[PDB]
C-alpha cells in the first residue's frame, strides 16, 4: 500500500508518506529497502514539487519535511525560471514564513536544527536565483528582523554564512563566471550593513549560541572581505581577548584568527605591524591563563581525548604555524617580543610531541620552513638554539622508515638542516640515545630501528673527519649491542640496523677500502642466514652500496691481486647458493652495475661473459636437451629453471643497458626458438583442456617464459645505443616470432606484453622500419580492437597497451595509417572515439592525444586529396564525439584535452585552413564558407541534444567559442559556462560575453 504516494492521479496522503519515510529511516532489512525505492521515485517525479507546500503544512514527520525541501531544491536549482513571477514570490514567501515560524517557537528552534538548516539552504538557493535584482529589500529586512528575536538573529547568521559559502567558496564550479561576479559584487555592495550587524552582536554579547553562529559567519567573510573591517574596528581585540576566554567561542575564534593571519594586508605600515603583534600576544596570553601553560604535557592531554581538546589542539597548531610562517620576523628584532616568540615556538614543540601522524605532519611543515630559514637567513639561528635543540630530539624519536617517502623526506630535510646548525648537539643526542639502547632503558626493536633510520638520514652533512669518528663510534656501539643481545630475533634486528647504517654512509666506505671489503664479505656471510629478513637486507644493502661505490669494485685496490668484481664473480655460485630466485636476480643486477663502470670494451665483455657463466651453462644444457626432445619443456621444474634464467638476463640487462648486447646476441636465436616452442605448447594445451588451461600452473609457467623474453627484448631496445644492429639483427626475428603467434591465439591466450614490446620497438626504431610498423598494425590492430570494443572492462591490460601502441605509431610512423585500406582507417577513427568514451584515465588521455596528433598529421600534408577526404569524412565525427564527452558529465577528468581538441578543430575552420566544403552539395548555397556551415551544424546539434536551451543561448555560446578559439583559458571558461547552463532552464545568453 506504500506505493500509494507514487499514484499522482489521486491527492497525496501525508500520513502514508510519513509512514514510508519512518519505515526508511527507522525500519530494517526488506521493509527499509522498499520504502527507499518508493521515496526515490516520489522525489524524482517531476511534479512532486507541487506537493511540497502541502507536505510542509500537514506532515508531523520532520524527515518528510526535509525530503520535501530536497524536492523544492531540485526545482529551484534546475527549473525555477519556468515558473510565473507570482508562483516564485509564493514559494519565496512560504519558505521565509516557515523559517520565521520555526525560529519563534523556542521548542522547535532547539530540537529541529536539521529542518531549519535545510530551510535556510533552500532560501539561499532562491537568493541565488532572485537576489538582488528581483529582491532588493532582502538584506535590509534580514538586518531589521534580527532585532525582533535572538532565535531569528541567530538563524539569520546561518543564512548569511550559507550565502557567503555559495557565492565565494563553491561558486567556481556551480555558476557561470558572469553570475558568480554578479553575486560577489552584490554581497560586496551590501557588506557594510551586514558587518555593522555582526559587530553589534559581537559587542552586545550574551547568548553563546548567537555569538558562535556570528563567529561562524565571520570565518566565511574572512575568505573575501578587505582587511580594514578587521584592523580599523575593535574586532581584532574582541577575537584575541573576550572570545578566547570562553570555551564555547574559543574553537571558532581560533579558526577566525588563523584566517585573519591570511588577510591581504599593507606591508609598509607600523600601526598594522603593531596590531598584528598585539592580537598574537593577546591570543597566547589567553591560552596560557585560561587553557594551559607553555610547560603543559599536550601529548598526555591529546591522548586523553577529553571533550573537544583534540580539535582545539589541532586548531592551535594551525594558528601558530600559519601566523609564525608569515609574521615571525615581526617578533624577532625587538627584545620585548623575544619571550612571546619563544613561548609560541615552545607550544609548537609540545604540539609536535602529540602521537597523531597528521598533526605531526602539520607542525613538521612549519619546522621545515623555520630551519630552512635559519640555514640561509643571517643573524637568526642564535634566537632559536633552545627550540632547535628540543626539535632535534622530537625528529629523531619520530623518524619513520625511508619506505614512507614523503614523511621520511620531510623529516630527513629538517634533521639535515638542524645538524648543519649544530653538529655537536645532533651527535650528542644520537650517541646518548644509542647508550639508552645498550643499557636496556629504551631497548625495543621499534626504538633501535627508529634510531638507525635517524642516524642514516644525516649522512653527508658532517665534515669527512667528523663523520669518520661518528660512524666508527656508532658501528662499535651497534656491534656491542649485537654481542650483548641473546637469541637470533634480537641479533637479526641489530644486524639489519648495522647493514642499514653502513649502506647510508658511502663517503666513509669509499675512503676505507679495508672496511668496504669487510662489509661486502659480511653481507656475503649474511646471504647464508635463513633467519627471516636477513638475506633480503643483505641483498638490498649489497645493491645499495654498489650503486654508490661501484668504481671501488672495478679498479685494482692497493694490496689486492685483482679488481674485487673478479673476486665476487669467481665465488658467485657459493655466495648465492642459499638465496631465493628474486635475491639471486638482485645480486646479478648489482654485479651488472659494477661491470657497466668498466669502460674498456674487451674487459667489460669478458666480465659480462664471466657473470653470465652459470645461467649460460644451464641454458646451453636445456637448449641441447629441449631441441633434441621437445617434450622436456612440459616438465614443471624445467619451466621454472628457464624462467629464472630469462629473469637473470632481465636483471643484468636492467643495470647494463647498451652494454648487455653481446649477452643478448649469445642467447637471441635460441631464445626466439624457445618463444615459438612454448607458444605451441600453450596453444595445444588450450585445445586439449579449454580456456581453463590458461589458469593452470603449467600454462602460467610457460606464459611467464614468453613475458620475460618480451621484457628482456624491450629492456635492451629501450636502452640500445646501436639502433642499426637493433633493426638489422633483432627486429626481423622478433616480429616473425611474436606477431603471427599473437594474431592466431584465442583472445584469452594473447599476451598484452606483446603490445608493450612493440610500443618500445616503434618508439626507438619506428622511423627505420616502415614495413615493420605496417606488419605490427596488420597483426595486432583489428584482433585487439575486437577484444576491447564490446565493453569498458574486458582485457584492461590489452586496452591500455593498445592505445599506447597506436599513440606511438601515430607519432613516429603515420605513413603506416596512410597505407590502411579505407575500412581499416574508419576502424582507426572508431578506435580513437572509443578511447574518448573511457572513464579509465590512461585510455581517455591517450585517446584525446592520438586525436590531436592525427589532426596535426593531416594538417602537415597540406592541400592534397587524402587530407581533403579525411575532413569531409571525419571532421564532424571528431567535433560531435568531443562535444559528447564534454557535455555528458561522465568524462570530467578529460576536460582539458577535450577543450584543446575542440579548439584545434574550430580554429581549422575559423582560419579557412580546410580547402574543400565540409557540406555535401545542395545542402547550402555553393558559395557558403565552412565557418557559416560549422555554426549552423553546431547550432542544430546542440539544439537537438539540449532542447531546453533557447536559440539565443546556443548562438551566443557558439559566437563566444569561435572568437576565443586562439585563447585556451578563455575558451575553457566558455565551455564551463555552457556546462553550468545545460543543467538549468533560462540561462542568460549575455553570460558568454563575460570578459576579464
Amino acid at each position: 500500500s506504500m506505493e500509494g504516494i507514487l499514484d499522482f492521479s489521486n491527492d497525496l496522503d501525508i500520513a502514508l508518506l510519513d509512514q514510508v519515510v519512518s519505515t526508511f529511516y527507522q525500519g530494517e532489512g526488506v521493509q527499509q529497502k522498499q520504502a527507499q525505492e518508493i521515496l526515490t521515485k516520489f522525489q524524482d517525479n517531476p511534479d512532486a514539487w507541487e506537493k511540497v507546500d502541502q507536505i510542509l503544512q500537514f506532515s508531523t514527520n520532520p524527515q518528510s519535511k526535509f525530503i520535501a525541501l530536497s524536492i523544492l531544491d531540485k526545482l529551484i536549482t534546475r527549473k525555477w525560471k519556468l515558473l510565473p513571477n507570482d508562483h516564485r514570490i509564493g514559494i519565496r514567501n512560504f519558505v521565509v514564513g516557515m523559517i520565521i515560524s520555526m525560529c519563534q517557537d523556542d521548542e522547535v528552534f532547539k530540537t529541529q536544527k536539521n529542518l531549519i538548516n535545510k530551510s535556510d539552504l533552500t532560501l539561499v538557493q532562491i537568493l541565488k536565483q532572485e537576489w538582488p535584482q528581483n529582491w532588493p529589500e532582502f538584506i535590509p529586512e534580514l538586518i531589521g528582523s534580527s532585532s525582533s528575536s535572538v532565535n531569528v538573529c541567530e538563524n539569520n547568521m546561518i543564512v548569511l554564512k550559507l550565502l557567503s559559502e555559495e557565492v565565494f567558496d563553491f561558486s567556481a564550479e556551480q555558476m557561470t563566471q558572469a553570475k558568480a561576479l554578479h553575486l560577489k559584487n552584490s554581497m560586496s555592495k551590501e557588506f557594510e550593513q551586514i558587518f555593522k550587524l555582526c559587530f553589534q552582536v559581537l559587542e552586545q554579547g550574551s547568548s553563546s549560541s548567537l555569538i558562535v553562529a556570528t563567529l561562524e559567519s565571520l570565518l566565511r567573510y574572512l575568505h573575501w572581505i578587505p582587511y580594514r573591517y578587521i584592523y580599523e574596528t575593535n574586532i581584532l581585540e574582541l577575537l584575541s581577548t573576550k572570545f578566547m576566554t570562553s570555551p564555547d567561542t574559543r574553537a571558532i575564534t581560533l579558526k577566525c584568527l588563523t584566517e585573519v593571519s591570511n588577510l591581504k594586508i599593507p606591508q609598509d605600515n607600523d600601526l598594522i605591524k603593531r596590531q598584528t603583534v598585539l592580537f598574537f600576544q593577546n591570543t597566547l596570553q589567553q591560552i596560557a591563563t585560561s587553557v594551559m601553560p607553555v610547560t603543559a604535557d599536550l601529548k598526555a592531554t591529546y591522548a586523553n581525548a577529553n571533550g573537544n581538546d583534540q580539535s582545539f589542539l589541532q586548531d592551535l597548531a594551525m594558528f601558530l604555524t600559519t601566523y609564525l610562517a608569515r609574521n615571525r620576523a615581526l617578533l624577532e628584532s625587538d627584545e620585548s617580543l623575544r619571550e612571546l616568540l619563544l613561548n609560541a615556538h615552545q607550544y609548537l614543540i609540545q604540539l609536535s610531541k602529540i602521537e597523531e601522524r597528521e598533526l605531526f605532519k602539520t607542525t613538521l611543515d612549519y619546522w621545515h620552513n623555520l630551519v630552512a630559514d635559519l640555514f640561509y637567513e643571517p643573524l637568526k639561528k642564535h634566537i632559536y638554539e633552545e627550540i632547535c635543540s628540543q626539535l632535534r630530539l622530537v625528529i629523531i624519536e619520530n623518524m619513520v622508515r625511508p619506505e614512507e617517502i614523503q614523511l621520511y623526506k620531510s623529516e630527513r630535510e629538517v634533521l639535515v638542516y638542524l645538524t648543519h646548525l649544530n653538529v655537536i648537539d645532533t651527535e650528542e643526542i644520537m650517541i646518548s640515545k644509542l647508550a639508552r639502547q645498550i643499557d636496556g632503558s629504551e631497548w625495543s626493536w621499534h626504538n633501535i630501528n627508529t634510531l638507525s633510520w635517524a642516524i642514516g638520514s644525516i649522512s653527508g652533512t658532517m665534515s669527512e673527519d667528523t663523520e669518520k669518528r661518528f660512524v666508527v663510534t656508532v658501528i662499535k656501539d651497534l656491534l656491542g649491542l649485537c654481542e650483548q643481545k641473546r637469541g637470533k630475533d634480537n641479533k637479526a634486528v641489530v644486524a639489519r640496523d648495522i647493514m642499514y647504517v653502513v649502506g647510508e654512509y658511502p663517503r666513509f666506505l669509499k675512503a676505507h677500502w679495508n672496511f668496504l671489503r669487510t662489509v661486502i664479505l659480511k653481507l656475503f656471510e649474511f646471504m647464508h642466514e635463513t633467519h627471516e629478513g636477513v638475506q633480503d637486507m643483505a641483498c638490498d644493502t649489497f645493491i645499495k652500496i654498489v650503486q654508490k661505490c661501484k668504481y671501488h669494485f672495478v679498479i685494482q685496490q692497493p694490496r689486492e691481486s685483482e679488481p674485487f668484481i673478479q673476486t665476487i664473480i669467481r665465488d658467485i655460485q657459493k655466495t648465492t647458493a642459499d638465496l631465493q630466485p628474486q635475491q639471486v636476480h638482485t645480486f646479478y643486477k648489482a654485479c651488472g652495475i659494477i661491470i657497466s663502470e668498466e669502460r674498456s670494451v674487451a674487459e667489460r665483455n669478458r666480465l659480462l661473459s664471466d657473470l653470465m657463466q652459470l645461467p649460460n651453462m644451464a641454458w646451453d644444457t636445456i637448449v641441447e636437451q629441449s631441441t633434441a626432445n621437445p617434450t622436456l619443456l612440459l616438465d614443471s621444474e624445467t619451466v621454472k629453471i628457464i624462467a629464472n634464467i630469462i629473469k637473470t638476463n632481465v636483471a643484468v640487462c636492467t643495470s647494463m643497458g647498451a652494454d648487455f648486447y653481446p649477452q643478448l646476441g649469445h642467447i637471441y636465436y635460441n631464445m626466439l626458438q624457445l618463444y615459438r616452442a612454448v607458444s605451441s605448447m600453450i596453444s595445444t594445451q588450450v585445445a586439449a583442456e579449454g580456456l581453463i588451461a590458461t589458469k593452470t600452473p603449467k600454462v602460467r609457467g610457460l606464459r611467464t617464459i614468453k613475458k620475460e623474453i618480451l621484457k628482456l627484448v624491450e629492456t635492451y631496445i629501450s636502452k640500445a645505443r646501436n639502433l642499426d644492429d637493433v633493426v638489422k639483427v633483432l627486429v626481423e626475428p622478433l616480429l616473425n616470432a611474436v606477431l603471427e603467434d599473437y594474431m592466431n591465439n584465442v583472445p584469452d591466450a594473447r599476451d598484452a606484453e606483446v603490445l608493450n614490446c612493440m610500443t618500445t620497438v616503434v618508439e626507438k626504431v619506428g622511423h627505420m622500419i616502415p614495413q615493420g610498423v605496417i606488419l605490427i598494425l596488420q597483426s595486432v590492430f583489428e584482433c585487439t580492437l575486437d577484444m576491447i570494443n564490446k565493453d569498458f572492462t574486458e582485457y584492461p591490460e590489452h586496452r591500455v597497451e593498445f592505445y599506447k601502441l597506436l599513440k606511438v605509431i601515430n607519432e613516429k610512423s603515420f605513413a603506416a595509417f596512410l597505407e590502411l585500406p579505407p575500412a581499416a582507417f574508419k576502424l582507426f577513427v572508431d578506435a580513437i572515439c572509443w578511447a574518448f568514451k573511457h572513464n579509465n584515465r590512461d585510455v581517455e588521455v591517450n585517446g584525446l592525444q592520438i586525436a590531436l596528433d592525427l589532426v596535426k598529421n593531416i594538417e602537415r600534408m597540406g592541400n592534397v586529396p587524402f587530407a581533403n577526404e579525411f575532413h569531409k569524412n571525419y571532421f564532424f565525427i571528431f567535433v560531435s564525439e568531443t562535444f559528447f564527452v564534454l557535455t555528458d558529465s561522465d568524462h570530467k577528468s578529460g576536460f582539458s584535452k577535450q577543450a584543446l581538441l575542440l579548439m584545434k578543430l574550430i580554429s581549422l575552420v575559423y582560419d579557412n585552413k580546410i580547402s574543400v566544403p565540409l557540406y555535401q552539395e545542395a545542402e547550402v548555397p555553393q558559395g557558403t564558407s565552412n565557418q557559416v556551415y560549422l555554426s549552423q551544424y553546431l547550432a542544430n546539434m546542440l539544439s537537438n541534444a539540449f532542447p531546453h536551451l533557447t536559440s539565443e543561448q546556443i548562438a551566443s555560446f557558439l559566437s563566444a567559442l569561435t572568437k576565443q578559439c586562439k585563447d585556451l583559458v578563455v575558451f575553457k571558461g566558455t565551455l564551463r559556462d555552457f556546462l553550468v547552463q545545460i543543467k538549468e532552464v533560462g540561462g542568460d545568453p549575455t553570460d558568454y560575453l563575460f570578459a576579464e
Binding site: 614443471s636 581453463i692 589458469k695 593452470t696 600452473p697
Partner: protein, 120 residues
C-alpha cells in the same frame, strides 16, 4: 585457552558461491590446528588479520578429502558440512591457499595427522 596449537600457517580462505559460480574470499590470517585438552578433538580455527574475526571454525572430520584446485599448486579444496564462523553450523566448499607449494604440502600432512587424532 583449553587448546594446544599443533600447527600454525598464514593462509587465505575462500568459499565457493554456487549461484555466482565464483570463489569469494572469506579471510586472510593465521590458520591454526587446535587440540582441545579435554576431548583431544582437533579443529581448524582461522582469524582475519587486524579485525581478528573468525573466518573458519570446524572439526577436521576424518571424512574430509583435500583436493587440488586446477588454478593452483599451493591450494586445497574440501567440503565442510558444519562450520560455525558466522554462527549457525553451515556447509561450505572451502579453498585455502598458502604462500608456497611447501606450506600447502605441510598443511596436507598436518591435516591428515589431525584426521587420525580425530579418529580416536
Amino acid at each position: 585457552e583449553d587448546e594446544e596449537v599443533l600447527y600454525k600457517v598464514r593462509a587465505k580462505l575462500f568459499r565457493f558461491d554456487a549461484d555466482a559460480k565464483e570463489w569469494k574470499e572469506r579471510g586472510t590470517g593465521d590458520c591454526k590446528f587446535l587440540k582441545n585438552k579435554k576431548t583431544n578433538k582437533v579443529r581448524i580455527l582461522m582469524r582475519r588479520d587486524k579485525t581478528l574475526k573468525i573466518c573458519a571454525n570446524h572439526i577436521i572430520a576424518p571424512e574430509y578429502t583435500l583436493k587440488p584446485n586446477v588454478g593452483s599448486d599451493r591450494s586445497w579444496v574440501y567440503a565442510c558440512t558444519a562450520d560455525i564462523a558466522e554462527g549457525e553450523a553451515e556447509a561450505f566448499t572451502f579453498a585455502i591457499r598458502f604462500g608456497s607449494k611447501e606450506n600447502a604440502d605441510k598443511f596436507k600432512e598436518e591435516f591428515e595427522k589431525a584426521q587420525e587424532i580425530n579418529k580416536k
